[PDB]
């Protein structure tokens, strides 16, 4: 019964590449995620796509529902991502932190696993 899943992945990936041509594949998806900063809510909210790019860099795109402004960020090291309270916390080098709020708390641990397994060597 995998046809509809193959097609959905193909439509999703075609749209992603339309915005970001270097995107190579979708690793997984979380239906509804909001982005936070300090913790203050940003304008960015929508579907979260964990993606691999041309150079094998792991990252994610949120296709924003609030405006055409999307978010695309890389996860450079699996250690960059922690579960703290209700946020999936994503840290870049010198204390640059983004907080991901997953509607559905199941996706926190789920996406955390996927990110670590994507960056596993």
């Amino acid at each position: 019964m995998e046809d509809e899943n193959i097609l959905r992945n193909a439509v999703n990936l075609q749209v992603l590449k339309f915005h970001y041509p270097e995107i190579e594949s979708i690793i997984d998806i979380a239906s509804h995620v909001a982005v936070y900063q300090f913790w203050l809510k940003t304008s960015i909210e929508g579907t979260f796509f964990l993606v691999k790019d041309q150079r094998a860099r792991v990252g994610y795109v949120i296709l924003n529902r609030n405006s055409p402004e999307n978010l695309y960020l890389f996860i450079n090291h699996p250690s960059n991502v922690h579960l703290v309270d209700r946020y999936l916390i994503h840290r870049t080098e010198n204390q640059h932190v983004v907080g991901l709020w997953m509607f559905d708390p199941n996706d926190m641990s789920r996406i955390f696993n996927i990110v670590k397994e994507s960056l596993l060597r």
Partner: protein, 90 residues
């Protein structure tokens, strides 16, 4: 990006951004699907048309008709029958 994008590429975007990837809990629901189509319609009229002036301004019924004709699997992915959707919006 939406500049120079075809009507077809716009409908693809809107499907993936609003319709295709609903959580299991929001599937099998006519009113939720309608809400998402409505949200997609606003995004289209408000953001997409401001970027590409050649795109047609559409009412809700005609917009929905074009999103669903563009991809009949939208019914399958949201787990809603077209019959039920039509009876809801009459």
């Amino acid at each position: 990006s939406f500049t120079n994008a075809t009507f077809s590429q716009v409908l693809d975007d809107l499907s993936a951004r609003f319709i295709l990837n609903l959580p299991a809990e929001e599937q099998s629901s006519v009113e939720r699907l309608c809400f998402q189509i409505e949200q997609a319609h606003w995004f289209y009229e408000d953001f997409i048309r401001a970027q590409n002036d050649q795109l047609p301004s559409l009412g809700l019924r005609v917009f929905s008709a074009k999103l669903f004709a563009h991809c009949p699997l939208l019914w399958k992915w949201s787990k809603v029958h077209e019959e039920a959707f039509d009876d809801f919006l009459r």
